[PDB]
Design a protein around this ligand. Structure first.
Ligand code: CLA
Ligand code: CLA
Ligand code: CLA
Ligand code: CLA
Ligand code: CLA
Ligand code: CLA
Ligand code: CLA
Ligand code: LMG
Ligand code: KC1
Ligand code: DD6
Ligand code: BCR
Lengths: 85, 215, 617, 89, 74, 132, 185
């Protein structure tokens, strides 16, 4: 009974006020999602959208290199986690 | 058990953490305390040759793991650091209490009484600058030797080991440093008792029957 | 249509403003539009007051003799009055400091008041226009910078209408000039200025310009602190709402305290009733806002929080410690305050008032003497006398104030205990491990597991609101009796008879009700008749709340079923009413508890308002 | 004329001085009523807007203003969040 | 082979929502069938709010305790 | 193969662990992970696996050296202490107001630098601990 | 037409807050004086004695009621003599309790110590009984010899309790007791 997803975890979904009606897959997914959020050392920055009509800002950070290193980090983290279990 | 996140204080599987200073890595302290106490300098003949710690103040850091799994109470290493610092400060304070009454150095207001010199130097335009310089120098020599991590028993330095040894001590093959440390600790406790006696005499005259005429 | 039950009313009306559940206008733009509409309503309410003050009121006669005239609120035209009552009543008098506020902010005519009403109506129209077009652009409006700018503009207004503004040389045109030139409109004298017996308008204007500038700087500092360490990890309308409500409650309670002790409205302390009503009203508002902060914190826990190792996670993990220690504090405070009061009651009853336990409030006396008082009143901590003292209305405490403050601490700690306990058990107790899946408010979990009445998180607020009202009643009794003794010059009847609770009855409640009850009797009726009638009405509402709180649903549902049977079996009406349309059902358990609490607090507020008016009239 | 009730009204001797005239005449009351009628019309418009909610096409078919575009892109003024917070910074 | 806690051995409950969470109970019997999700039947001295002191637990929700590695004073 | 209940629990654990380790990366794309909500800002990780603040926590002055920040905080502390002392006790400025003359702007500007010194020394230690 | 008594503040613009050390004592406070020479307290005592004498006069000489009221009068006289050493304001005359911490007549430190010792005794006796009677039967059915053994043995509570606290036998590890983790912490 207490393995149901919490309302905050199911926020903005159809099961926000009725977490007892969510699927087992959905409850497990959101319970893993909340844990994923609490690992900002490996959480991805999710770059800003390009909404302004002007040219793209040159910035100083390469999103491609960050995405590649995040792919590597995700692969290694998944490998280590599966080794643990 | 409980997941990796959501682990705080009393939750099962929560490793104890110690990170008070913003900018320093998290340190995970083991209980220790009693183990360090069993092999700790002090405990001379005056109390029977055993480590005189009634009230069990050195065991409270071990009891932190039982109370809330938080470093509320100091490690015995922090207790020795505090004892050493108090002893040195009280040695200097006793010598200052009995030297200010007879000597005067700077442009500070003439106040032989020790209980008023601090305030009168606060009020002095040419005393506030000097006390500010004293304060910044003390802060430098205190933050450089921050210890602090001794609160959880991992200081990486023996207690009272500031970067100060102009003489050949701690380096000569002779001059066993254990005896020197014991002398420092016991003279520090003696100076703290002396400062307490000075305060008692200042507040309750005739308490110590040797400083009756003292300030 | 309408084939629902009467339960539909109280089910939706309880969530009619729970816009997060309203999927249509769920966006934050709609919530800002609701704020705009609420501010339009506030502007129209202030326009109401100003319009009726300027229409049928004596503000022009008030500015001339603020001490000798009683402010008129509005004209009374009740058809139920008897010619005598019509001849008796002049107009509805004033129980709010709007005359004093208008006098302070520079109103000197009814034409200015009328222009103010027109401006308030136009500003309400502007607010409605802004609410017409919710938009992320309008979400830019607001911020601590905006409110600090409002403070700066109010400072400018007060400078323009300060009494010394006539002597002010134009700074922006002839330069700053001498210091006295600025002192004509900007001062920091500190405390009561004598005469008006209130803070100088120059002091208020200077305060506001300083507060606005400091607020601009603080907002900039907070936003650069958001530059590095940019973490909006937990955003929720209820978290921010709880923050706003707690800050507003603190500010409103502080407003009550510092407006009694440092009145900013000219000739306000001379009006006892308005001062007492101001303090009581603002303290009730502040307590309500703090309770709302706790409630919305609980709601954020219920349906917007995700467990983490954060501040809230740490609070939740050791919630047992928090609840247990708060329970210990409340038990100690209640035991000792009640026991000392009962001991004083016994000693005074047994003709031995000396043997009472009067613990001198030496800590508050020490604070007062060392930090506030400019003359030796108690002599503890310090005895220096100020060469150039400043004036204010800080009361001088005595033995009874110790017990009263301990009662206040008991009330505050018990309210916090109930609110914190409910909010932290919204995550679950061992009687209800899955409260995270049941929502903020629900009836119960049934008679099983021994019973689960009032186990909901909303029921925690329902229980704690009685304690909110009780705590506010305690310290408002304290304030009211203290100021009544000060104004009646007793100051010794209070200091002796407040030690025992029979004093609190006889000398405060029974004594101050003598004139209120004589509002109307066989001899006739005077201006206090309305307040005696409201006293009775409030008692009636309070006891109806008793009905809704004591008796629970099932009985009433069976009774309503029998009444429906009578209707369906009644002649001339079974052809017309089949109970299918808006079926009459008993109020749900949550609805019943809320309605009982609402009657309880309505009777509470109206009873105390009528008593305050009848005592300080 | 009033029958005074309450010890402080009698003690302080404050008199409820009725103004000789009314204070707002009748023309200015009519102007206030007209402005309140305009405010009432705006309130009816707001009530109709809120009761039926925001239509789904607006905020979806109407392109955001460049201010709104840049604010949502950079996460300002309560954007990049799920709160209102009028006292943001 | 036998899987799960031994019969009659004290176990600590790891189920967060159980009335006896982190408390101690005696194992009555463990169902030696792989399809049973909660085979470990544990008896407690304390009764819950339902006045029942026996409940079945999963294999991962109970921690078997040695004869002297727990606290006899609860 | 007559899947065990413990095998079902093992699959649930595997699914939860994989999801948790997968949603962290740039393959979930949720509003929470947007810059300025939960993540650490793209190229500026504030702290690593050990909870030690990196130089990125300082913002614009993320590359000002430890020695320079120490000098800045010490100068700010000295100037602020001088201004505070000269405003409150030595040549008090409120008493100067009582004399009818304005404040001395130097004292106020100096005393404004004490919280500057506070945050400056905190940033100085952050830089020193990072080797900057 | 007047307001409440206006109090005078200290326009403390000097930048320092001075706390007088000599005023940190009951004898140095200008609003409380010993009951012996407090005129209001003496008037209270006189009024009490007069009321007691008036009550006594109702009953004839030598009656049991007369003797009872006479004993009440003697008790009141002795109580007044004892209270003459207390501290009672300057306008009330009612003896006060000084909760600063100074050991004075009518202080709080000694009563606080006595109560704390007594109730630590009570709590430690109950806790010892519960620890040595881990059984609901012995809770409903008090083992009177063991209960009184614990009650009379709890006299050493202040030191035994601290020894158990420092040795880990007093508090329980948070991972070994029923703690609220239903939120799946
Ligand atoms: C606050 C200063 C201070 C501190 C932190 C310590 C710390 C320590 N002392 Mg120590 N000591 C001190 C002052 C201090 N000492 C003084 C002034 C004396 C002279 C009597 C001694 C004499 C002494 C002996 C003889 C021994 C220690 C030992 C120890 C160690 C274990 C005891 C412990 O955990 O106590 C730490 C906690 C405290 C000290 C708490 C102090 C707070 C109390 C409540 C204050 C009460 C005193 C009060 C002012 C009355 C004054 C009494 C008068 C005699 C001055 C530890 C490193 C033992 C050791 O070396 O172990 C190997 C040991 O055998 N100490
Ligand atoms: C707001 C609290 C606060 C915080 C978070 C810090 C943090 C820091 N200080 Mg610091 N400091 C503080 C207050 C604080 N300080 C105060 C008040 C002073 C006295 C003016 C100092 C004086 C100081 C010096 C002189 C130095 C530091 C240094 C440092 C840094 C590392 C070494 C250290 O922490 O040891 C210092 C630890 C402390 C001073 C402990 C302070 C604890 C506070 C005061 C709480 C005390 C409350 C009491 C219970 C009218 C009912 C670190 C970033 C060092 C540095 O810059 O890097 C090398 C250094 O040399 N500090
Ligand atoms: C600006 C402040 C603010 C805001 C925006 C909100 C907003 C909200 N609150 Mg909230 N609240 C606040 C302050 C605030 N509150 C305060 C200060 C308190 C403490 C008193 C509470 C206590 C509170 C509770 C306990 C609950 C909410 C709930 C809610 C949500 C639904 C509101 C709803 O439909 O209620 C419906 C509103 C009403 C039914 C209004 C009642 C009408 C009154 C009682 C009329 C009586 C007055 C009458 C004229 C007097 C007659 C006198 C007599 C003599 C004649 C909504 C998000 C609910 C929620 O989120 O649950 C999921 C909820 O359960 N709030
Ligand atoms: C916080 C800022 C603030 C506030 C709340 C007020 C409030 C007020 N001022 Mg005012 N004032 C201010 C700043 C402010 N002032 C500043 C900075 C100055 C100096 C330039 C003045 C100079 C000033 C004068 C000279 C007078 C007032 C007057 C008034 C009163 C009536 C004005 C009115 O509604 O009719 C005028 C406004 C309208 C008819 C329509 C409203 C204007 C727009 C449409 C609404 C604004 C929307 C809002 C900004 C959002 C009212 C109490 C009058 C009075 O009698 O007070 C004693 C008056 O004669 N003010
Ligand atoms: C919204 C902001 C605002 C606005 C529009 C004004 C507007 C004005 N201020 Mg003003 N003022 C403000 C804020 C504001 N104040 C604040 C916050 C302060 C506090 C520092 C002052 C302090 C101030 C002084 C001291 C003086 C003015 C004066 C004036 C007037 C300038 C001369 C004139 O009438 O030209 C057309 C004008 C009415 C001058 C004046 O004559 O006003 C009576 C003047 O001497 N103001
Ligand atoms: C007069 C009415 C009254 C009284 C006395 C109480 C008393 C109490 N309520 Mg309460 N309550 C009331 C009305 C009242 N409530 C109402 C109407 C509501 C609305 C439903 C609530 C809602 C409510 C909630 C929601 C909560 C409380 C809580 C509490 C307790 C707070 C702790 C405390 O003060 O202990 C002091 C206890 C007393 C003053 C009771 C009297 C005890 C004796 C008679 C007085 C002392 C005599 C003497 C010292 C003892 C002699 C010892 C020896 C010589 C024999 C306490 C038992 C809180 C709680 O239980 O936390 C612990 C809590 O969470 N109450
Ligand atoms: C062995 C007996 C015993 C012991 C050691 C404690 C100890 C404690 N209780 Mg407690 N309690 C007890 C019995 C006991 N209680 C009983 C019988 C009740 C039911 C009335 C309660 C109700 C209770 C509440 C409601 C609260 C505590 C709290 C507390 C804690 C703070 C101390 C306090 O406020 O005490 C105050 C004690 C009371 C108000 C009730 C005392 C009733 C009697 C006097 C105690 C019984 C003694 C026992 C029968 C002795 C028999 C010995 C004999 C068999 C040999 C502390 C851990 C508080 C807490 O959790 O704070 C952290 C708290 O809020 N207790
Ligand atoms: C003087 C004023 C003081 C009196 C006002 C005090 C009211 C206390 C403030 C608390 C208000 C918030 C409480 C609230 O909204 O929830 C109180 C409850 C919350 O709503 C309940 O929510 C539950 C699930 O959350 C269920 O859905 C219940 O059916 C639903 O009633 O609201 C009601 O019970 C409303 C019923 C009464 C509605 C009558 C409207 C009165 C309008 C006349 C004007
Ligand atoms: C060569 C350069 C030099 C000179 C020439 C010099 C001289 C004086 N120093 Mg000085 N000094 C340093 C440098 C110099 N000091 C350095 C590097 C340090 C850090 C280690 C330091 C520390 C302190 C402290 C802590 C104090 C202090 C003061 C005085 C003083 C008395 C003035 C007077 O009484 O009028 C005089 C004449 C004391 C004082 O009284 O200041 C009010 C005071 O407390 N100094
Ligand atoms: C460390 C170091 C160095 C150094 C050093 C320094 C600065 C060392 C300084 C040492 C110093 C300054 C040591 C003072 C002690 C004062 C005491 C113990 C006071 C006691 C006070 C007492 C005992 C009071 C006692 C009494 O009240 C009692 C208890 C009761 C009464 O009946 C009797 C009286 C009233 C008398 C070198 C050499 C420079 C280089 C080397 O390389 C490294
Ligand atoms: C439920 C909950 C929640 C909520 C919470 C809340 C609601 C809180 C509040 C809080 C608060 C509401 C706070 C407040 C605070 C305040 C303060 C902190 C103040 C202080 C001050 C002081 C301390 C001072 C004092 C003084 C004076 C002024 C005078 C006299 C003397 C003295 C000095 C004492 C949340 C969800 C979020 C989380 C979870 C749980």
């Amino acid at each position: 009974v207490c393995q149901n997803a919490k309302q905050g975890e199911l926020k903005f979904t159809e099961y926000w006020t009725k977490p007892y009606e969510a699927d087992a897959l959905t409850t497990l997914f959101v319970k893993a999602r909340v844990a994923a959020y609490n690992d900002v050392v490996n959480l991805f920055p999710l770059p800003n959208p390009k909404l302004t009509s002007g040219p793209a800002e040159p910035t100083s950070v390469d999103y491609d290199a960050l995405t590649k290193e995040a792919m590597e980090g995700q692969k290694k983290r998944i490998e280590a986690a599966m080794a643990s279990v | 058990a409980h997941p990796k996140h959501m682990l705080v204080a009393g939750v099962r599987g929560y490793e104890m953490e110690w990170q008070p200073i913003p900018g320093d890595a998290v340190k995970y302290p083991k209980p220790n305390s009693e183990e360090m106490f069993k092999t700790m300098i002090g405990a001379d003949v005056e109390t029977g040759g055993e480590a005189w710690d009634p009230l069990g103040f050195h065991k409270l850091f071990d009891r932190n793991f039982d109370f809330n799994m938080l470093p509320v109470y100091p490690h015995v290493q922090w207790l020795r650091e505090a004892e050493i610092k108090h002893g040195r400060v009280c040695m200097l304070a006793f010598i200052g209490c009995f030297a200010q009454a007879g000597y005067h150095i700077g442009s500070y207001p003439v106040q032989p009484d020790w209980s008023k010199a601090l305030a009168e130097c606060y009020a002095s335009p040419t005393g506030a600058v000097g006390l500010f310089q004293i304060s910044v120098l003390i802060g430098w020599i205190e933050g450089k030797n921050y210890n602090g991590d001794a609160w959880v028993g991992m200081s990486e330095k023996e207690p009272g080991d500031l970067g100060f040894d102009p003489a050949g001590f701690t380096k000569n093959p002779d001059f066993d440093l254990k005896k020197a440390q014991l002398q420092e600790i016991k003279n520090g406790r003696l100076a703290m008792v002396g400062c307490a006696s000075i305060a008692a005499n200042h507040f309750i005259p005739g308490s110590v029957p040797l400083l009756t005429g003292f300030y | 249509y309408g084939r629902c039950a009467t339960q539909r009313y109280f089910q939706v009306l309880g969530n009619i403003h729970d816009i997060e559940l309203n999927e249509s206008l769920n966006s934050p733009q709609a919530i800002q539009a609701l704020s705009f509409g609420q501010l339009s309503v506030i502007l129209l309410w202030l326009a109401a007051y100003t319009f009726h003050i300027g229409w049928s009121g004596n503000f022009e006669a008030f500015i001339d003799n603020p001490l000798g005239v009683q402010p008129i609120n509005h004209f009374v035209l009740d058809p139920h009055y008897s010619q005598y009552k019509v001849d008796t009543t002049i107009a509805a008098l004033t129980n709010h400091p709007i005359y004093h506020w208008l006098m302070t902010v520079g109103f000197t005519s009814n034409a200015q008041i009328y222009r103010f009403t027109l401006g308030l109506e136009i500003t309400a129209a502007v607010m409605l226009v802004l609410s017409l077009a919710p938009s992320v652009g309008l979400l830019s409006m607001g911020g601590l910078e905006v409110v600090s700018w409002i403070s700066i503009c109010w400072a400018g207004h007060l400078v323009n209408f300060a009494p010394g503004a006539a002597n002010l040389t134009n700074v922006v045109m002839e330069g700053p000039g001498s210091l006295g030139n600025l002192m004509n409109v900007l001062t920091f004298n500190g405390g009561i200025q004598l005469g008006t017996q209130a803070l100088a308008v120059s002091d208020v204007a200077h305060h506001h310009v300083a507060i606005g500038i400091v607020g601009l700087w603080i907002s900039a500092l907070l936003r650069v602190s958001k530059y590095a360490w940019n973490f909006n990890t937990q955003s929720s309308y209820h978290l921010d709402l709880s923050l706003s409500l707690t800050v507003g409650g603190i500010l409103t309670s502080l407003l009550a305290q510092q407006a009694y002790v440092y009145p900013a409205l000219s000739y306000l302390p001379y009006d006892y009733l308005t001062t007492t009503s101001l303090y009581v009203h603002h303290q009730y508002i502040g307590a309500f806002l703090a309770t709302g902060g706790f409630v919305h914190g609980g709601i954020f826990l219920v349906r917007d929080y995700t467990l983490s190792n954060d501040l809230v996670g740490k609070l939740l993990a050791t919630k047992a410690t928090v609840i247990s220690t708060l329970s210990w504090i409340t038990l100690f405070l209640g035991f000792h305050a009640t026991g000392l009061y009962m001991h004083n009651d016994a000693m005074a009853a047994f003709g031995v008032p000396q043997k009472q336990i009067i613990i001198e409030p030496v800590f508050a006396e020490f604070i007062q003497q060392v930090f506030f008082l400019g003359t030796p009143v108690y002599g503890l901590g310090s005895a220096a006398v100020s060469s150039t003292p400043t004036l204010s209305f800080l009361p001088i405490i005595s033995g009874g104030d110790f017990l009263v403050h301990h009662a206040i601490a008991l009330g505050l700690h018990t309210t916090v205990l109930v609110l914190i306990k409910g909010a932290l058990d919204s995550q679950g107790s061992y009687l209800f491990p899955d409260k995270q899946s049941f929502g903020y408010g629900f009836a119960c979990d049934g008679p099983g597991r021994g019973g689960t009445c009032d186990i909901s998180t909303w029921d925690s607020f329902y229980l704690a609101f009685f304690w909110v009202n009780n705590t506010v009643a305690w310290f408002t009794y304290y304030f009211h009796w203290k100021v009544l003794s000060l104004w009646q010059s007793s100051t010794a009847v209070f200091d002796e008879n407040s030690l025992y609770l029979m004093g609190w009855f006889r000398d405060y409640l029974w004594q101050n009700c003598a004139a209120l009850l004589s509002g109307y009797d066989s001899l006739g009726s005077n201006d206090l008749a309305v307040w005696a009638w409201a006293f009775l009405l409030a008692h009636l509402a309070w006891a109806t709340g008793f009905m809704f709180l004591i008796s629970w649903r099932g009985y009433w549902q069976e009774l309503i079923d029998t009444v429906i049977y009578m209707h369906l079996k009644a002649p001339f009406f079974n052809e017309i009413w089949s109970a299918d349309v808006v079926t009459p059902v008993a109020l749900s358990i949550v609805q019943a508890r809320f309605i009982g609490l609402a009657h309880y607090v309505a009777g509470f507020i109206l009873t105390y308002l009528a008593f305050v008016v009848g005592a300080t009239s | 004329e009033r029958i005074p009730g309450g010890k402080f009204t009698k003690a302080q001797g404050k008199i409820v001085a009725t103004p000789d005239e009314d204070g707002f005449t009748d023309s200015e009351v009519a102007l206030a009523l007209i402005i309140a009628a305009v405010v009432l019309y705006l309130a009816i418009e707001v009530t109709k807007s809120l009761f039926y909610g925001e239509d789904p096409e607006t905020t979806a078919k109407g392109p955001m203003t460049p201010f709104e575009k840049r604010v949502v892109e950079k996460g300002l003024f309560g954007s990049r969040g799920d709160s209102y917070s009028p006292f943001r910074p | 082979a036998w899987v799960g806690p031994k019969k009659g051995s004290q176990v600590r409950i790891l189920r967060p929502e159980s009335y006896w969470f982190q408390q101690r109970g005696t194992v009555v019997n463990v169902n030696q069938k792989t399809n049973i999700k909660y085979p470990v039947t544990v008896k407690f001295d304390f009764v819950n709010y339902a006045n029942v002191n026996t409940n079945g637990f999963a294999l991962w929700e109970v921690d078997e305790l040695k004869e002297g590695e727990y606290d006899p004073d609860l | 193969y007559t899947e065990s209940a413990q095998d079902a629990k093992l699959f649930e654990t595997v699914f939860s662990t994989y999801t948790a380790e997968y949603l962290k990366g740039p393959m979930y794309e949720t509003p929470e992970k947007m810059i300025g909500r939960r993540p650490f800002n793209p190229g500026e990780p504030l702290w690593g696996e050990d909870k030690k603040l990196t130089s990125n926590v300082l913002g614009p002055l993320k590359r000002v050296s430890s020695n320079e920040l120490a000098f800045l905080t010490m100068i700010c502390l000295a100037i602020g202490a001088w201004g505070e002392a000269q405003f409150l006790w030595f040549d008090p400025q409120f008493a100067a107001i009582d004399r009818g003359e304005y404040f001395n702007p130097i004292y106020i500007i100096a005393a404004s630098l004490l919280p500057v010194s506070f945050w400056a020394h905190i940033a100085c230690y952050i830089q020193k601990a990072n080797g900057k | 037409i007047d307001t409440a008594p206006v109090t005078k503040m200290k326009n403390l613009k000097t930048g320092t807050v001075e706390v007088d050390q000599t005023k940190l004592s009951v004898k140095s406070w200008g609003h409380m004086e010993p009951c012996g020479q407090n005129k209001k307290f003496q008037k209270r005592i006189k009024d009490e004695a007069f009321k007691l004498k008036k009550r006594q006069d109702k009953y004839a000489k030598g009656s049991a009621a007369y003797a009872g009221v006479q004993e009440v009068i003697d008790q009141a006289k002795d109580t007044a003599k004892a209270y003459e050493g207390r501290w009672c304001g300057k306008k009330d005359g009612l003896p006060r309790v000084i909760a600063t911490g100074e050991v004075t007549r009518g202080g709080i430190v000694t009563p606080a110590l006595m109560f704390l010792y007594t109730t630590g005794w009570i709590g430690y006796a109950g806790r010892s009984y519960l620890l040595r009677t881990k059984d609901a039967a012995k809770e409903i059915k008090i083992d009177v010899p063991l209960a009184l053994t614990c009650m009379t043995s709890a006299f050493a509570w202040p030191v035994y309790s601290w020894q158990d606290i420092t040795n880990g036998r007093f508090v329980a590890k948070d991972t070994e007791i029923r703690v609220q983790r239903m939120h799946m912490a």
